[PDB]
Structures are given as C-alpha cells and as structure tokens.
Amino acid sequence: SNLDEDIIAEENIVSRSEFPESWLWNVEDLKEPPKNGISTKLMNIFLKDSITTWEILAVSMSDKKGICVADPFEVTVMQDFFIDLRLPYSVVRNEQVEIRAVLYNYRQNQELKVRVELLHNPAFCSLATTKRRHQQTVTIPPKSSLSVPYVIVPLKTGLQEVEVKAAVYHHFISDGVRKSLKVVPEGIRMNKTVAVRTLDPERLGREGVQKEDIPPADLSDQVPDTESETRILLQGTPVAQMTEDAVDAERLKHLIVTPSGCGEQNMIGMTPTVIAVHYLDETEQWEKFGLEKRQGALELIKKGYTQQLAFRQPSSAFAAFVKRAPSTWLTAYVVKVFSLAVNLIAIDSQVLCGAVKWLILEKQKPDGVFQEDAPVIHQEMIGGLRNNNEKDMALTAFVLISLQEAKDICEEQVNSLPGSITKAGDFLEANYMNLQRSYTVAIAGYALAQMGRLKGPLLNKFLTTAKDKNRWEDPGKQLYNVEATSYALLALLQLKDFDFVPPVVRWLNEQRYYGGGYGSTQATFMVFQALAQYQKDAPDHQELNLDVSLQLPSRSSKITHRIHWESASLLRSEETKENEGFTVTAEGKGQGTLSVVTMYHAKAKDQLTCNKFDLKVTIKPAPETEKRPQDAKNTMILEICTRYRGDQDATMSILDISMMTGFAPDTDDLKQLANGVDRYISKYELDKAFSDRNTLIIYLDKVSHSEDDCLAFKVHQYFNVELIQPGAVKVYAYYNLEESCTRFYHPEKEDGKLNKLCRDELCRCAEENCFIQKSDDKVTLEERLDKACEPGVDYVYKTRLVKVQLSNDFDEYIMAIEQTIKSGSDEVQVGQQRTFISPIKCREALKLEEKKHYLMWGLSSDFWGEKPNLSYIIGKDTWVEHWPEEDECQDEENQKQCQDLGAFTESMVVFGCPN
Amino acid sequence: XICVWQDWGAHRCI
Amino acid sequence: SPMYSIITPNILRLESEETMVLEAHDAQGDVPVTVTVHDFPGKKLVLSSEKTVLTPATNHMGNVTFTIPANREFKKGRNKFVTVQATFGTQVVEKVVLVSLQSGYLFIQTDKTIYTPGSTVLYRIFTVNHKLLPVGRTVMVNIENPEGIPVKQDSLSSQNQLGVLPLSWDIPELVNMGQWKIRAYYENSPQQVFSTEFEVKEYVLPSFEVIVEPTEKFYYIYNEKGLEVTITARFLYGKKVEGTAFVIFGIQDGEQRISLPESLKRIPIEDGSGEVVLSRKVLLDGVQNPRAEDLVGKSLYVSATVILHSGSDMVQAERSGIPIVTSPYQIHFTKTPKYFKPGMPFDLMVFVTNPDGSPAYRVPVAVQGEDTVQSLTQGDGVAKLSINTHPSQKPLSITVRTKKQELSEAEQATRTMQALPYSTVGNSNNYLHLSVLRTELRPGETLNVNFLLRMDRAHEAKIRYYTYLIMNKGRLLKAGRQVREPGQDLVVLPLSITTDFIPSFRLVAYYTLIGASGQREVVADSVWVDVKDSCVGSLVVKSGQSEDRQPVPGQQMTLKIEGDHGARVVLVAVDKGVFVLNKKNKLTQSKIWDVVEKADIGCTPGSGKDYAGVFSDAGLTFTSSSGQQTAQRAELQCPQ
Ligand SMILES: [Ca+2]
Ligand SMILES: [N]
C-alpha cells in the first residue's frame, strides 16, 4: 500500500488488559534491622492496567505487639488520553447490543483528533471484517470526553472479549482496551426439585436398609445446546435426646434442715439435706439455688454425721439410744446415707465399714437373710418396710442395697462382703417369684439387678408387676408407692432398659412429691436418688452414622459424604452435571434428609426484555423543505414513542439516543423539544458542534402509563461514511437502569439489526466474508491450478446459473452442477442443483446472470446447514469466474480465458493435484 | 473550691 | 488476727493467663500461699496449682499467675464455675468464680466486599488471644449461603503461622445472590462464633463515585432554609464529573421509610458538584402537615443518582440517618459513675456528641445551679465537671447543659442523671475517692491518680497504704501499693501509661482498717480511664518514591512498609470502584478495639453502692478470711 498517516499504527498498539478487582495478596516479613524501633521494607510492585485508584491495605502480626491494621494507602493510576470500554456483566447469545467506548482527553489546552477502531472477532458480529476494522475519526476538546457507540452481536457463549484501540493524529500517543464479558444462552435459570426423601434405616427401614430411587427429570422446556446440572443435596439431622425435666432447685430449699435428736431422729434430719445436695450436684442446679449455700449445706451434713457418732456403739452398730440394743435396719440405713455422702464430707471408713462388718457377722442368717432383732421406734422412717409381709425379702434387699453402696470403699477392709452379698442375693433370687407385693418386687428387683441376676422370669415378673407400665403400686400409704417406684426406676437404669424408663420418670415427676415432713424419710431419700441417677444415665444425644452409599451410575465409586452427626448440617456434595439416575442405599443409625433439585436453562414463553417500558423507534425520509435549496443535506425524521408498563406514570426518565454514523440532530428541533412541558435537554448538549453530537440524552419528567408519549426530530447527514452503523435508543427511569428498553434504527436494516445468518441457535455474521472482485487480465493458468489444489479448497465445480433470488438479507443463486472437477464433503452428482448464498453487503462485487456458466471453488468452512438442506456461502475465499461459452471463445477478448479454463479443467480432471 | 467535709486535712471544706 | 484476701477477675477465661492478687494484712513474717483451682462443685480434678510466699519485704502483697486449661468438664449452655482456693499457711480462703468458655478473638479479612459468580474469595483469619497476641490453635471455618446453611467447612491449626491463616473459596457460576457469611470459631470455644459478610452479585465496576452529604450533620426543625445537600461526583482516578443528578428525599420513622415524591429534583453536576435543598414546606406537607415538633427524633435520608453527560455510566448513592433535632448536641453520662461519696467531690465525665454520634469539640458544658462549674469538651467530646457533695444520703440529681455562645437557650443540649450514695460499713462515714485528669491520654505519658480520703480524724492515722489494681482487657494488668502518712487527705500515684493500657483501663483501689473489737472494714473506689486508640506497635504503607507525577498503567513502583521488627505483614490492593458498590465489613483497627471493648468484664464507669459493688462492677472478686467478700456474679454479660 501507499497511504501514509501521521498516527500510530494499529499494529503497534498493545491493548491494556489486566484489570483485576484485587491483587497484591502478598505476605512480607519485616526482617530488616530496625532504626527507630521501626523496620522498613522496600517492595517493588508492578501496577496493573486499570486507570483508577488502588486502595492498598496492610495488616501486621507480631509476637510482642499483636495485630495492627494500617490506614489505607492510595495509588492513583492515570494517563492523559485513554479508552473506558463499558461492557455489561453479561449478554445474551445472538441478541444485538450497543456498547460504549468512552474516550477521555485530559490534556488541558490541547484538542485531540482521534481514530478509534473496533477489532474483528469471530465470536461477534459487528461492522468490522477481517479486511478492515470498524474505524471512526472523532475530535475531543480539552478537558472533555466522547462516547463512541459500537453495535455488536455475540455469537458464542462463554467468556468472550471486546477490543477497541485508538490513536491521536500528530501526537504519538495511543490506547487499547481488551475486556471480557460473559455470553449466556437465551434460557432462564430454573430450579425444579424432583423429589425430597427422608433417610432413616433404623426407623423406616424394613430389613435394615433404606432404598429411595428417583427417576431423572424430563426437562422438555430446556433450550437446545445448553449445559444442565443436577444438584442432589444431603443434609442430616444431628439427633438429640428427650430427657424429662429435673426437679427445679427451688423445690429443694425446704430440704436443707438442721439435725437434732437421738440416734434415729438425727438421721431423720440428716436425710433430706444429704439427698438434696446429692440431687443439686448431679443436676448442676446450684446456680438457681445460690452457690454459696452449698458450703452451708455441707456443714449441716458434717454436723449430722458428727452427731450420729454419739450413737455408734462399741460393736460399730447403731441404735436410738446408747443402751438400746442395736437395730439392723438403722445400722444399714446409716450405711445407706453415709455411703452417698463420702464425696461431700470426710466419712471415717472405720465407721462405715465397721457397720458393714457388724451387719454381716451378727445379723445375716445362714440362709442369707438379714434379721432385725431390735426394731426402730420411729416406725414411720422405714417407708414400705413398715407393716410388710414378706419381711425377710424386704429387709434383706434393703440391707443388701446398703452393702452394695458401700462395697467400693469397704471391700478392702471387710473380707466377708463379697460372700455376704452373694448369699443374700441367693436368697432373694430363690424367692423372688413368690413375691406378692409390688413394693418388695421393686426393692428386691433393684437388689437383683445390681448383681446382674434380674433376668428371665424374674425380669418379666419385675416388669409386668408395674401398673400401666409406669409405677409400682400397692394399696396403702401413697408414700410407699413413690418409694417403690423409685427403687424400680433405679433397677430399670441398672438394666439400662432405657425404652421403659420414660413413663416411669414421668409418673414420678407428675407426683410432684418434694419430700420432707413426718414419715418422709425413705420416700425423700429414694425419689431424689432415683431421679438423680436418671439425669446421670440419660444419653446426651442419639447417634448418627448414616452410611449412605450414593454413587450415581457412570461415576465408578469414590468417597461419599458422611454426615457423621458432626458435619450433618454441612451441605457440601459434589455432583454430576449430566442428568443421571439416582440409586439411594442407606445403612446406619439416625435420620437425615435428601433433596434433588435440577439445574438447567429453560426458554421463556415471551420476551424478558422491555418488561417495564414499551419503546418504538422509526426512521424515515424527511420531505422537501419549503426553502427549496440544493438540499444536498440528506435528512431523515427520527420518531421515538414510549409508554410505561405500570399502574401509574413513570417519574423522571431518560432517553439515551445514539446517532447513525455521520448523522446529527437538527438543533432547531432540539430547541423546540427542550422548550416544552415535561422535557429537558441540557444546555451543555444544545450548544455543541459535531464531534460531540453522535450522542444525545433527552430527559423526560414523566412517561405515561396510559398511552404512548411520542416525540420526533430531524437528523441530518453531515458526513458520508461507507458503513452507517445503526443508531440506538434506550429508555429507563432514573431509579432503575436495569428496567430499560433498547431499540435500534437504520434506513436499510430491518429493525436496525445487523445482518446475520441463523439456523436454530447458531448465527454467523453476514456483515463480513464478502466475495472479492478480481480482474480477468492478471490471472494465469498456473495460478488457478496452484490455488485450486490447496488442501483448504474443498470443491471445484463448473456450474450453470439456473435461478437468481434477490432479497434484502441474502441473495440466492440456485446453481446447476454440470461438472464435478474436484469433490469434497458434499457428494453432489452432475445435473443436481445447489443453492449458493451471498449477503446483500457483498452485492457490488458479484456479477451473476441467469443461464450463464461459472467456475466455482470454495471452502468447507462456508457450508451452511445439514445434508438435506446443505447450501453454500459465497465468501472471500470463494472463486467465482464467468465461463465463456464455446461460441464466445472465437472472440479475441476471450482467447486467454477460454485457453486457461479449458486447460484448467483438463489438468484438474486428467492429472489431478500434485502430491 | 473542691474539698472534703471533715475536721482534718489540707483540702477540708471551710 | 491477720486477714488474708484474694482478688481475681470475676469472670475467668480458660487457656488465658489470669493473675490472682494475694495480700496478708496485719501479718508478720513470711506467709506461704498455695493457690489451686478446682472444678465446681465436684472438686475432683486439680486444674491449676501455684505457690508463692508473702514477705515483709514485699509488704505481704504478691500474686500468682496460672492458666486454666481446656478440659472435658467444660463445654446445655449452663454457666460453668471453678472453685478458687488460696491457703495462707493453714487458713483456706475460697471463692467460686464464673468461667467464660471463650478463649480469644478471631478476625476475618476478605480481599473484597463484593464478588461476582465465578470469582475467588481470598480471606484470612487472624488468631489472637485476649491480649490480642498471636496464638496457634485449632479453628473451624464455615461459609454460609444467604439461607444460613454452611456450604463449606474447614478445620485448621494456626500453629507456626504467626496467627495468620490464609484461605480461599471459589464461588460457582450458578450460585444464589446476596449476603454470604464466613463463620469461624476456636475448636475449644464453639459458643463464640466470629463472622464477616460478603456480597455475591452480578455487576461491573463503575467509573466514578457519588458522595451525598448534608451541609450540616442534622436538620434543625426550625431552619426555614430546609435541608441542603451537596452532591459530589468524581472519577475513581480523581477528575471531576460532568453530568446530571436525580435527588429525592425521605423521612425515616423507626423502621418506616416514607418517600417525599415532591422533593424529587433533577440538577446539573458541574465541575464534580451540585446542590439540592429539601424545603421545609415540602417536608412538612409530605407528612400531612403536623406541627414540626412531631418530626423531632426522626431522621431524613437522601438518594442521589448521577448520570454522565455521555450517559455511558450511572452511580447511585444514599445518605441516611440525618437526625431531625432541636439541638446540635446531645449529652451522655455513660462515662460518669452512678454513685457518689457523701461529703466528697463527685466528678462527672460528660460526653457530648453531634447528632451522628461523633464527638463534639470545644463545646462548653456546665452543671445547672450550685457553684456554676463550666468546662470545655476535648477533642474526644469529653469534659470533666467536679461538684462538692454534702454529707447526706439524699440522692444526687445533676443536670448538665451546653453553653454554646452562638446558640439560643432552646438549642442547648441538656441531660439529667442520678447518683446514689455509696453505702459504708456500719454507717461509718468512711470513704475513698479516686480522681484523674480527663485530658486525652497517650502511651508514654504519666497519669497522676489522686487518692482522696474521707475518714473521721480519730481513726484517720491508721490508714498507711492503699492497694490498687489495674484492669485492662478483662485481666489484671498491674497491682501495687500507694503509701499514705497521717494527716494526708490526698496522695498522688504517678502512673506511667504504656501501650499495655490500650484501649482503656480501670483502676480499683481499697484500704482496710480494724474497728475496735476486731471488726474489719473494707472501703473501695474505682475509676475508668480511656486511652487513645492506636496500634500497640505501628504499621504504615506509603510511597518509596517522589510524587513528581501519578503513575501510568504497568509502571513499576516501590512500596514502603514501616512496621515493628519481625512482624508478618499481609497485603491487598483493591480497585476503589469496588467500594463504590459495597464498603461494608472491612477490617479496621477501630473495629478491633470495639470488639475488645464489648468483651470487657467490668460493667460500670466506677464506684458502687458498697465496697462489694465497687469490686464486682469493675470485674473483680474480693474474698477475705474474715468473711468480707463480693457477691456471686449472676451473668456473663453486663447488666442493662
Ligand atoms: Ca480507647
Ligand atoms: N466552708
């Protein structure tokens, strides 16, 4: 070429492209020797390409000084001339949009003449081709900016790039921006939950397994050629336990009493205070009670223990009075109380085990029975033992329970303890079945459960003795049934028969028996001992190991998600995108939930665009002015009609108008519009000469919801360019840019749409790939042969033009194949016809006339459609050459071509291509 | 001015 | 007979250094002390065991330090307790103390405030103990979707990491929009969850920033000019915006937002700036013309939308919470003790703010009536007012007003509080008053702490010393003795202030004397003292070049980092356009100290209804062998 311009060439512009939103995610250690106790680190960084201000934040961590967040430090990156390429976050495939390249001139006293260009890209359709980029020359005053519109159509989904470059005449500066945006399909995201099932193999499982198969979804409304996903989520329930409430601490205040009296009455007083502390300790209820009161309660317990020692006889046994024969029951009850208090105060082992040894050596009969030879005189403090038939059984069980309670402390001191326990258990076990009273069944039931001997028929007798499966009851004082049910609860906990305990603990709590008072000793001690052991033995939570084997088909077998109670709330589950079957097999304790939601893109029934505004835009020739001049000023009328789709008028709204290339609004028309009810055009914009008049914003005070509001103004063509880009109009209310509507306009393009070729969801640009006119005089035979034998050349044909079809989109040439010179993909036979397609843009370079013959060759990359509807696109790499008839070859003007074409055919057919 | 009501001390109220 | 006493924080934290102050009053010779910590009430395991000796040389005052470990007995949300038991020779002094399960602080930094689907969230977790120093422990980290369900769980130790745990998470392309959460907690303290939020949204970065500010931080209800607002619009690289602004106002009443459609204005933005007024008439007409006084206590908000003259970019910004007032100021007594010592000076620490809560500088304040004491607020909005009190149980009602020269009386702020008399032991009329200058206090300075004694003169000479204790960050930082010689009603402690005292401290002081027949009397006071917030160390990032011009894209540049020797520094660079869209949840040093201050175990500005209340309200137990002690603390949180 020869053109020489005073401007940086496009080839020597490297576009800016590194625009991260954050960077410098760096770690630095201040190892340098400190000067003022301050260590300084010099750090070389390379600034990104963004023209912005960076905010750099540092946080430091020190062993001696802790954490310090610095004040932010700002670095402004700036430049006198540059492009701001404003791309949307995303755009829909095959939908036309307008983007703006905003050109900034921050030189203070210098105006810039600028050439800006949009680069060609096969992922988009625009006015740029591979022969010439879409270029524009503009003038930017100092301290100003200019918005350059580009109209593009995204042709393929995914991350795509737009690139714009610009240079300045007579000042050798430049800029380029290469910026990405997401191209998405036309289908809207849709979540359709197909099935939600619960998983519990040990609850709803039949043979120990939970099978829950779900078929895949049909997804008939899905757009074609789009990716879909299937999200099958797994959320387990960390399972907990239902524990009956403890007795509230306030109910035990009256149980803190001071002991007094002789050997029996002192223990009546000591009983409630010991068991109350026992219960408050186990239920962790001292906070509600008042913590510092525990110290005082311990002191009262020590006082009761100390006072009871005055009634310890030389034999180590106990009686009401020092000269009274010792009581078997009272000595065993002292063991019962003292043993539970060994952790609360200092209990002398010689006192406790001395009483144990005396019971065994003096009061156990050869057959194992414990015998009372001097009954207590407070007959109300022995509970259900009073007036009890089956006395040997009841008293033996009572003493044995005391021995068991003391066994851990006293085993080492009382050799006779293991054999005494065995002998007493033998007696109880041998006679348990003949028992008639529920009280004895309960107390001896507990004693036998402590020895692992409550089994089989004895276990069944114990359980079936209970009334309504929640209480052990005889006729008499209701206190005896509270005490008996407490013994049974302790036996149930000993057996770990946890399915049976809830109704029993409920019946006891419903009793609301809080102990204390006349005759309350055994019931008070036993109910709180039993209810404390209930809280101690209560399981904190149920178990979750749902070992669900959930490997979908064609996924082999990998590590599946274990909710494992700990991570049950966690939803993390990697999934396959392709819709497949769901085979669920659950095994394990606990319960969980399972849901299957399907992802995909689905086509909407109608437009998602222009939902809040209607917008209709027309462009038409202006009529003859009454001045009647030369009127070389090609003038059109642009009319814009808009309506708000709501119950009330829109408030303040914006008409953002871009001109067709080389057109500018009529100033007098703008002044007429700017002076008007409900409309404003800024003075900044009414007084501008061109190289700023490609854009125009009209401000509306309102937009009617009841009917179109319409305006019109003339636009004049001040500059012919080869390619007139469609203009555009965008309407929206100030408070929501999203709820807009954009229309395009152009005198020659349907609806202002760039020409493109679309079958189904694939489109290719038809503003490019034009046939190239070539003169006949230069082309030799060797050059035709050398070109037609290139591997890229798929087909070579001699044809006859049967039928021409001119339209404003694509011209069709239904062409008859008279000779298959070189075959390719399309196995066309001689005589068959094929349709050749050429865009309207390319019309000047193609000289095709019906009934005439042509030599044609082309590329497989220019095929369009499938086999039943397989047409050929005539493009830049398509050879199309008129074939003179035999009868025309005698003309001197045809000799060279006739010679070339005849020899070309003979060589192609007879000898073929070299190598 | 600022003082303390008592019979002793340099800052007692008068 | 010697009285032994122990003083601890009244909330003990596990896995953190705690100090117990031990004193043997009126004892002679060496006193051995064994301190142990048991679980309550079982007292089975020994959690800690320390020993010391109290000698005449150290005036029979010392301490032990120890660390209760993380156990199985701790962690259904019931309060846990330990029994602290000090044995002086053979005399046991026992105190049951509340335990806090939370073991330190976690701070979470994300690289940005907002993200698109398909991008990566970079984040760090800073693992510090209660002294804000780095620790190496195990942390659980969760990422929660807007529905509050964890999508991702991690378990990491920060051992050998200098308290910095770098992490990341890839946001899928198909994701739910909205507020996402990063939740972290120490493995041993699952009750304490630390959090930060980040937004997930579809956006492009704007090219400029819009700032909306009223000409005053309030709307005065009798200002006939209405509310004037300045709209500023600047490109991110600093240049001024030319364009058009749409401005509309509203009034907020509790949670109700009421737009004022007649206030909508379209104005030019020329040279980056524009002005708009909400007229008083439009405001009052917009709420159906009540009397203007009914709007006081509500607030106004302003939304501005700015469009470039090219129409190629748009940015919206809102300013909300503009109070409608009758006064430019408000007075707060939140830093003044609610108890006084009858017969002694009562010091008020008056906090004056503008209606947005920022401190008000150089505002005159005065106590209504009496001696007409009048003071000027410092840069921290604080002013000290001292009044004399008479020896009577009559509760003290105090009203403070501003005296701003330029304002009318109706425009001056006013506030009233009540203080109750400190109750003495046996109606002894024996008191202690601490006093401090309330100027802005920096590390490296010396603070004179005044100890003022009220005691009848027959008993006076017995008080030879005060015990003082300094609480900071919920631990005992320091304890000492302030001597006194007979006849001295006022003695001064020169307290050297260091970075250890940031962000504030409490000084508790007490003396003890023997009434005849052996009855022991304990008299205490306390003050709260602010320290100006800064980093304990320091960290600055600046340019290592000469700013002859602004850099160009791709240019190499030297960063200069100035900090403490051996510190690990972690960095990020963020396009300020990000902050135009979302500026919430960023880590700052002011937020760290606010977290530290919320966690204080002291709860009042000072004094108390009695000696026990003085200790407890400052976060301390006191227990003596002769029965004088604080009451049980009921809750982990401060009363309200
Ligand atoms: Ca502070
Ligand atoms: N006075």
Numbering used by the authors:
A (entry chain B): 727 to 1641
B (entry chain C): 1 to 14
C (entry chain A): 1 to 75, 78 to 642
Give the authors' words.
Here, we present the crystal structure of Cp40 complexed with its target C3b at 2.0-Å resolution. Instead of the truncated CUB domain in C3c, the current structure had an intact CUB and associated thioester domain (TED), as characteristic for C3b. The peptide Cp40 was located at a shallow site formed by domains MG4 and MG5 of C3b. It shows a similar conformation to that of Cp01-C3c, with a cyclic structure being enabled by a disulfide bridge between Cys3 and Cys13. Rather, the improved affinity can be attributed to a strong interaction of structural water fixed by Thr391 and Asn390, which is shielded by the 1-methyl group of (1Me)Trp5. The N-methyl of sarcosine (Sar9) is oriented toward bulk solvent with no significant contact to C3b. While the unexpected orientation of mIle14 could be attributed to crystal packing effects, this residue indeed appears to mediate target binding via intramolecular stabilization of Cp40 rather than C-terminal interactions with C3b. Instead, our models show that binding of Cp40 to the MG4/5 region sterically prevents an interaction via the C3:C3b dimerization interface.
Finally, backbone N-methylation (Cp10, Cp20)13,14 and the addition of D-Tyr to the N-terminus yielded analog Cp40, which featured picomolar affinity and an improved pharmacokinetic profile in absence of PEGylation.
